[PDB]
Design a protein around this ligand. Structure first.
Ligand SMILES: *[C@@H]1O[C@H](CO)[C@@H](O[C@@H]2O[C@H](CO)[C@@H](O[C@@H]3O[C@H](CO[C@H]4O[C@H](CO)[C@@H](O)[C@H](O)[C@@H]4O)[C@@H](O)[C@H](O[C@H]4O[C@H](CO)[C@@H](O)[C@H](O)[C@@H]4O)[C@@H]3O)[C@H](O)[C@H]2NC(C)=O)[C@H](O)[C@H]1NC(C)=O
Ligand code: 06S
Ligand code: 06S
Ligand SMILES: *[C@@H]1O[C@H](CO)[C@@H](O[C@@H]2O[C@H](CO)[C@@H](O[C@@H]3O[C@H](CO)[C@@H](O)[C@H](O)[C@@H]3O)[C@H](O)[C@H]2NC(C)=O)[C@H](O)[C@H]1NC(C)=O
Ligand SMILES: *[C@@H]1O[C@H](CO)[C@@H](O[C@@H]2O[C@H](CO)[C@@H](O)[C@H](O)[C@H]2NC(C)=O)[C@H](O)[C@H]1NC(C)=O
Ligand SMILES: *[C@@H]1O[C@H](CO)[C@@H](O[C@@H]2O[C@H](CO)[C@@H](O)[C@H](O)[C@H]2NC(C)=O)[C@H](O)[C@H]1NC(C)=O
Ligand SMILES: *[C@@H]1O[C@H](CO)[C@@H](O[C@@H]2O[C@H](CO)[C@@H](O)[C@H](O)[C@H]2NC(C)=O)[C@H](O)[C@H]1NC(C)=O
Ligand SMILES: *[C@@H]1O[C@H](CO)[C@@H](O[C@@H]2O[C@H](CO)[C@@H](O)[C@H](O)[C@H]2NC(C)=O)[C@H](O)[C@H]1NC(C)=O
Ligand code: UPT
Ligand code: UPT
Ligand code: URI
Ligand code: URI
Ligand code: NAG
Ligand code: NAG
Lengths: 749, 752
């Protein structure tokens, strides 16, 4: 049973974020990858990894987590060391004496302003070399020095990244092995014919935002003089015949020279965000040169203090015959008409159109019907209404790279996202002349309307509907009923009316749904309903009811809601978290559907739990009671369930295990008793006729009496290595003084 | 130094002993105490032994005992050896009967929220001096309880009785034989269908009659609700209120009335407050004779009389409302209608003293705003919650049919005429939204999801607004002339407008703030501010108070960015600054130095500070209150006197201090209040118990530290004794964590 790391065989040591002060000397000799990131290690030497001949990969990022002193040659003994991560270590230099066998090296986020032959030039086997984010913004730092030719002997080098450093010029003498070159925010005004002359394997070039566009910069920003654009020689991309990805975001471009692409038949992604291209978008000569381009991003090229009626799309857009996705965030314009998008209407594989954050007031939705293959129409964040460093160095810096539309919703077919607009009611013609929509986001439109069953009738086949974060008035039992095919309904965060006792709250419409699988009513502050107190569906499988008031619905002096979920006959998953529950009436619990496999009652205030009621739940596999105020467990749990597979009990107040407990239920694989009040686990808790089938048991955060008693448990652990127990460095002694703070595992008996 | 209670002087002498986990009435109460609060403890028995030595007790509260975070067993005559007892509170103890042997001296008795179903002479009759008697909420809703048996003439003895509450019990009949001493009588939700001419004859002095909730209106009830068969309205006899000439307040809410007998009011022309909510009175409102019997009426509530499911065009208001010359306040919630025109409120236009008109929750889509001008004296126009566009659920001491909080927050209303349009759908302010308004001094537009770019002209029609609530919207701050038309503006709330602030790519312009000559208070909380456009500093010569909690100073003041290092400095007149919840782990020295030197008050609570530069307090010579609660501080400076002469309150609750520096708590004279509760202190040594020079130290909080209880403490325990003028609250909760013997008990309760 490994300590202090958790070790797995596929053979890896997860030893991260564990409060270590030096490399542990108890690390298995079999290990090949070792992750010590986010620890407190302050020194590395030849002694540090002396045990571990077979080390292939070492991760030392973010040490000490709140300088890392590395010796000359400290790693030289490691002969299979292929990969080395030293990010966020405040290194003043590239450590000396690094082993010849390295293929990956990351020195991101340090204080290295000098890139030397001494340090690098003998590392011939390097595939990827990461040096970014060492001098940037108003960080107090020197300009970056790059010894002439230092990269010349890296003849296997495929990736080199020097971004967010002050370079001023493309370093010379780059090896032609290069696949990817990252030079973003490197302060490089001018690119010349020589700079990339013999790099005929390059697939990725990144030159954003040298000559950045600084208006409204979310970071310290310094433009080229004037507001000049980056200056790229006419012949700078001549021999770049393999380029797939070109990033020119925030280089203040106004013209785009078509001839840059003369020899670029494979260009697939072209990123031009945060430039000044409104002219070029209206007039795009360069579009001719890109009939194989899949992704084009012209986001944020708005002219500040200009908000024209219409977007102006060149006819030459019609040449982009391979375009799957077009991104136009932040063009900023008032009105979208059908004629405005003519030039895109014939693009055979144009699948995604993204118009977020354009402050668009009026759209002509029939526009979208005259398109071949549109799967995702993204219009979030407009003005449609009724008719310890700030930035992640491993992410894109000019856009978010989450999916535009949740996968679970887009899987269903064509999607239209109108979220974060001001559609405060859906008129009779809001959705007229739309394509046949299967997935529809209307979240956060502050919609207050009474839905009656005709509002979604120009688009009857929506299968997934996001209605979250509105203020809907549920005063009609035929609401949403036109959507026969509906499978998923999100009504979370619509509490506005639900809070008000005296208005009507009608939830009857749930039942008129043949195929409805998942319903989310979370955070609606439900405490009263009108007429029909019960939820009912023959199909529903999942109901989330967290963030409501079951404490009030099931108050002792009220009987009306005692069967509120019983009519959910098919139900397997039910979430009752965050309902301020101090106790559930035995009858209301017994009225929970017998079909359940998954029950969550976490983050309430439960003081007792009638375990004996688990007799009526024969399919029940997971029971989650984390974050309540529980004091004890039944001493005969197998009398009550035969199905329970996971039991979650973190953050309760259990101080004692019943005799026999955890040899009680054969079916239990995962038992979680973290952050409770156990001082020991008596010999009696361990006696057993049945061999256990328990594979994971969590005990961290309990106040263990570390003295002679716990020996019997230590043996049990030793005599049950199949039972995994994570966070051993956090299964800690509270007593006594001597053992205070140490893992219960590190004491002699 | 009293234990376990807090004994105060206020003349009186009262002991607060509530919510203290007490299993039994403590015997360590100082035997000269007037009033004892023992509520919310875990006390299980009272006997004549409980209070033996406490003669001069005039008051005991034992509410919610034994209040599991079964019942309170009380023996007969337990209280009798207490001669002076006046007021006794035994609310919410699960009592099965009124206890026997109550002192004759009692004026006030409360038995609210119990299981007492039988009223008896053996309990009540011998209590001659009773002014007030509270027996409500023993049998209601779907509780398992028996009907409520009132022994005949059980109240007839109590000739001094002013107030009797029997509400929320099944009575069925208003008990006969009531003393004529009664001023106020409460029989709400008592199941009393019929009121005879004989039920209130004896009672010539009634100021208050509560008959609400009898034959309740049950549609959409938020409680269990049994209508009367029919469902009939309550039946009140023509001559039921014949002898009730002294009556001031009448509550007939939720009695399913459809018609009101005009002559119910013949002999009460001093009726002041008429509560008629949750009935069926839409007809009576359109044509109502009873409206001419209320010449001295001040408050009329006709809320929630909508007919399901009418959504009529208009409200129909009888011409007879105009004979309500004394009316100060008309509440008309939940009538539910679509439109309001001027001609709809004519009968109200001529009333001299009508200051408040409440139309909340009427799903109103349109309003002719000009109609609020042929009014004389409107100070409050409450239109919140409409559709304008461009372990017992209920508090037994509150009104049950309405919230009683002020309609408009007082700080706002004191400025003058108020107009609350909160919770509507005004998602932009059009150019004519506010024409024909009076001179609005206080305007609430909260929660309208206003997403507009305010540009200096949207409030031209009501330019004298001094308190502007724009919280909970999604304002787009893309114009530096936003709001500048409101010259006189004094308070601006823009909390919870983080929608566009979240989005880095759009502009965020906060420049307008400097254009206000009298702006005193500005609230920018929970806007999630982390980036601003062109101008990076907030500026005002006026501003006294800036609330900036729930924003992102951790980003603004990031180490790799200089731009916002003087963000607050141009707030030259500032005294109160709130920087809480900004996710700060450190504050750059230059940034802290750049806070206004006029600050008397600074909160940096609920951030994540591991270190604080105490030396920097030398630049803040007026600073009286520094609040560093809810952070991760690991030590104090041992040199505090060196950095401040001015500091009175220091709040360090919830940190990780584990050693008090040497000579602390006597460094500074000005320091009255030090809060070190819930830290990691195991001991305090004499080092900090110099106690050199003179200190104004007055309160010192230490509850929640893990004190290790051995001789090492003795010095400090001695120190407590030697300075009693230093108040140390919650001694109960100043607990030993160590060692085993002393676990769980106060530090005060030890010895050699
Ligand atoms: C200018 O434009 C170019 C072209 O679009 C952008 O280039 C991309 O840059 C991003 C951001 O760095 C790159 O994304 C990163 O690549 C790694 C993926 O490599 C492969 O191998 C991994 C496993 O090693 C596979 O799982 C994966 O599927 C890939 O096949 C990721 O490791 C990165 O990390 C992610 O996860 C880890 C988990 O720990 C985290 O550390 C990260 O935060 C993140 O979650 C990351 O995905 C991307 O690959 C680049 N494109 C190409 C074609 O190479 C430029 O970034 C852009 N420049 C700027 C400044 O915006
Ligand atoms: N360009 C862009 N602008 C946006 O505004 C935007 N908003 C969300 N996104 C999403 O961000 C994601 C990242 O796209 P991008 O930044 S243009 O990165 C390039 C590449 O850098 C990236 N990529 C490609 C290969 C790879 O190995 N690693 C990798 O990260 O995927 C993209 C093209 O891949 P491809 O070669 O299959 S044609 C894309 O989605 P997925 O394809 O689901 S990962 C976008 O949908 C945006 N992308
Ligand atoms: N009736 C009504 N309908 C509402 O919709 C509403 N919303 C808020 N409120 C507030 O509820 C509050 C309570 O009013 P109400 O339920 S009508 O109770 C009566 C009385 O029960 C109550 N009162 C009177 C005297 C007293 O000593 N104590 C006391 O509580 O004050 C009120 C007037 O008495 P008065 O003789 O001063 S004209 C009032 O606030 P105040 O500013 O205190 S007058 C209302 O403004 C509403 N009241
Ligand atoms: C029916 O309407 C009547 C008349 O307004 C309501 O009477 C009011 O009831 C409240 C709640 O008990 C009283 O307020 C309380 O007063 C005590 C004594 O000062 C105070 O300690 C509490 O904190 C609270 O403010 C109020 O005084 C009373 N009105 C009068 C004139 O006494 C009655 O409650 C209504 N019935 C229901 C069921 O809502
Ligand atoms: C509907 O729109 C909202 C807002 O655009 C989406 O909510 C975001 O979801 C992401 C990823 O799940 C979260 O991390 C963000 O916090 C959310 N933002 C906000 C403002 O809520 C939601 O995902 C969209 N729904 C679907 C089905 O695509
Ligand atoms: C409302 O409920 C569902 C929970 O069922 C949420 O969607 C699921 O989220 C989990 C991640 O929490 C995914 O692994 C599932 O794939 C999701 N299911 C579906 C159908 O998408 C949903 O996010 C919740 N909504 C909000 C606003 O919290
Ligand atoms: C403006 O309207 C809002 C909402 O109607 C008021 O907010 C309420 O304020 C009271 C007192 O602070 C709170 O107890 C309620 O919970 C609040 N509700 C909500 C939804 O915020 C606000 O106080 C009003 N402002 C003024 C100046 O009167
Ligand atoms: C915005 O901040 C203001 C000023 O701090 C808050 O108003 C005051 O709050 C305290 C109690 O919190 C009162 O004692 C003062 O009467 C109030 N000052 C006023 C009204 O000027 C206000 O509550 C904050 N707004 C929100 C939504 O939190
Ligand atoms: O019978 C009742 C009693 C109270 N209420 C509502 O409960 C709340 C607390 O009294 C009040 O809020 P409202 O203004 S929506 O009406 C009252 C009812 O709607 N019906
Ligand atoms: O120079 C920049 C880079 C990114 N951005 C915005 O920051 C976020 C992180 O990349 C992104 O969110 P947006 O879609 S508003 O645009 C990006 C800028 O506004 N300016
Ligand atoms: O938007 C509206 C308009 C009217 N009503 C009415 O309000 C009453 C109580 O909410 C119901 O009978 C219903 O007719 C609403 O609920 N919502
Ligand atoms: O509602 C609107 C309309 C237009 N813009 C413009 O969008 C750009 C970026 O926010 C700015 O120049 C601003 O004028 C807005 O910000 N908000
Ligand atoms: C029960 O759930 C299954 C799986 O989601 C589903 O196929 C079936 O339709 C549901 N039962 C009913 C009666 O709809
Ligand atoms: C400074 O604040 C006070 C109120 O605290 C006020 O009298 C004065 O007007 C303010 N200063 C200026 C320049 O307005």
């Amino acid at each position: 049973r490994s300590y202090p790391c958790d070790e797995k065989k596929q053979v890896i040591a997860e030893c991260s974020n564990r409060r270590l002060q030096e490399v542990p000397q108890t690390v298995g000799k079999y290990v090949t990858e070792l992750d010590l990131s986010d620890n407190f290690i302050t020194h590395i030497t030849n002694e540090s990894f002396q045990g571990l001949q077979n080390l292939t990969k070492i991760n030392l990022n973010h040490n000490p987590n709140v300088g890392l002193n590395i010796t000359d040659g400290a790693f030289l003994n490691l002969k299979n060391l292929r990969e080395l991560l030293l990010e966020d270590n405040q290194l003043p230099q590239i450590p000396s004496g690094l082993p010849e066998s390295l293929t990956e090296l990351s020195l991101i986020q340090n204080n290295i302003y000098n890139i030397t032959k001494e340090g690098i030039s003998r590392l011939i086997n390097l595939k990827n070399l990461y040096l970014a984010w060492n001098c940037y913004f108003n960080k107090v730092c020197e300009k970056t020095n790059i010894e002439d030719g230092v990269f010349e002997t890296l003849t296997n080098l495929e990736l080199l990244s020097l971004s967010f450093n002050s370079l001023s010029h493309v370093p010379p003498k780059l090896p032609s092995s290069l696949r990817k070159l990252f030079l973003s925010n490197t302060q490089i005004k001018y690119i010349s014919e020589e700079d990339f002359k013999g790099l005929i394997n390059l697939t990725l070039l990144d030159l954003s935002g040298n000559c950045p566009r600084c208006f409204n910069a979310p970071f310290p920003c310094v433009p080229c003089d004037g507001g000049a654009s980056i200056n790229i020689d006419r012949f700078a991309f001549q021999n770049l015949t393999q380029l797939r990805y070109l990033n020119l975001s925030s280089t203040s471009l106004r013209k785009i020279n078509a001839a840059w692409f003369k020899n670029m038949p494979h260009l697939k992604v072209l990123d031009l965000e945060f430039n000044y291209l409104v002219g070029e978008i209206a007039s795009g000569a360069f579009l001719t040169m890109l009939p194989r381009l899949e992704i084009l991003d012209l986001s944020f090229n708005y002219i500040k203090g200009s908000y024209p009626q219409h977007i102006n799309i060149s006819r030459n857009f019609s040449k982009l015959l391979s375009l799957r996705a077009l991104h136009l965030r932040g063009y900023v314009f008032q009105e979208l008409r059908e004629d405005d998008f003519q030039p895109l209407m014939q693009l055979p594989n144009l699948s995604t159109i993204n118009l977020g954050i354009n402050f668009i007031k009026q759209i002509d939705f029939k526009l979208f019907q005259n398109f071949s293959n549109l799967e995702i129409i993204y219009l979030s964040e407009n003005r449609i209404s009724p008719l310890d460093f700030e930035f992640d160095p491993h992410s894109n810096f000019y856009h978010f790279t989450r999916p535009l539309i949740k996968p679970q919703c887009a899987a269903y077919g064509k999607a239209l996202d109108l979220s974060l607009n001001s559609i405060f009611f859906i008129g009779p013609n809001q959705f007229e002349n739309l394509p046949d929509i299967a997935c529809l986001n209307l979240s956060a439109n502050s919609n207050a309307q009474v839905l009656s069953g005709t509002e979604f009738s120009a688009i009857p086949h929506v299968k997934y509907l996001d209605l979250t974060n509105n203020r809907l008035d549920f005063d009609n039992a035929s609401a949403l009923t036109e959507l026969s095919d509906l499978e998923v309904l999100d009504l979370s965060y619509n509490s506005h009316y639900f809070r008000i006792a005296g208005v009507t709250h009608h939830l009857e419409f749930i039942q008129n749904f043949t195929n409805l699988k998942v319903l989310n009513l979370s955070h609606n502050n439900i405490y009263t309903l009108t007429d029909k107190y019960n939820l009912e569906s023959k199909s529903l499988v999942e109901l989330v009811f967290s963030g409501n008031r079951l404490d009030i619905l099931w108050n002792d002096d009220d009987n009306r809601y005692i069967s509120i979920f019983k009519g959910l006959k098919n139900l397997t998953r039910l979430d009752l978290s965050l309902n301020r529950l101090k106790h559930i009436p035995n009858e209301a619990f017994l009225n929970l559907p017998a079909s359940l496999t998954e029950l969550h009652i976490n983050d309430n205030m439960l003081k007792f739990f009638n375990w004996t009621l688990l007799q009526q739940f024969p399919r029940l596999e997971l029971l989650d009671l984390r974050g309540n105020k529980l004091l004890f467990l039944t001493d005969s749990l197998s009398d009550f369930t035969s199905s329970l597979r996971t039991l979650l009990l973190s953050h309760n107040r259990i101080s004692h295990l019943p005799s026999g407990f955890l040899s009680e239920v054969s079916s239990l694989k995962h038992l979680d008793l973290s952050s409770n009040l156990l001082k020991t686990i008596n010999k009696s808790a361990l006696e057993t006729k049945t061999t256990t089938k328990l594979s994971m048991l969590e005990l961290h955060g309990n106040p263990f009496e570390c003295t002679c008693d716990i020996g019997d448990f230590r043996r049990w652990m030793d005599e049950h290595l199949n039972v995994k127990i994570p966070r051993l460095v956090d299964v800690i002694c509270a007593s006594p003084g001597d053992q205070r703070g140490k893992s219960i595992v590190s004491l002699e008996l």
